Amino acid sequence: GAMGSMERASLIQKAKLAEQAERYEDMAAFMKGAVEKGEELSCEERNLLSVAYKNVVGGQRAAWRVLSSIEQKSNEGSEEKGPEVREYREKVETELQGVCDTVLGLLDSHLIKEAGDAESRVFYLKMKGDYYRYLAEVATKKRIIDSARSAYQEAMDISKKEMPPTNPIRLGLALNFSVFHYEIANSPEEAISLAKTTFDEAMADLHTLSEDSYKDSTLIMQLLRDNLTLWT
């Protein structure tokens, strides 16, 4: 693609500049170019990839929710206003699905298959679950939900065998899988149980950590607690 002529290191450098400038679409394009060089990604590079696409899809998701709410209101004594709301919601939806397909394509060709260390493999499988979850949010679907579930479950199995309960990747995975259960899979009890168990097992391991690792882990634990407060 358009980044094929740029050095890998220059793409990474420009992704970091784009982040500082809050130019997340550019950041994502640079990171896609870096992945397509075919080398594995370091921890910092994986995080740049994730930040870029999370911000892009996050804006699309927020826009889709605004438009979907307007569309649902129009379908209630509501005056007919024509096809425009549906058309524009569909436009945003299609762009969102395209970004998710792009991310899933990078994971399948060939990030996941080359990822052997637990930290990288869990990271990518969590991403796979996340982007199928975003597809599920707009789908009208069973197979998409099962794809998200399967990716999260494989990531969970590796993380529980290979990572301590305070590891931030393990914690963020459990957080997002719990959101999947609550918001996608119609399984609030599973969501609550997973969040509780994850929080409690991390609590019991905090004593092993340095001050800086403690800060990293407790930040994500607080998100688990915030959700439990909302859900119970």
């Binding site: 998100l223 959700n227 859900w231």
Partner: peptide, 5 residues
């Protein structure tokens, strides 16, 4: 519901 950063 909050998801990961």
């Amino acid at each position: 519901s909050r998801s990961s950063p």
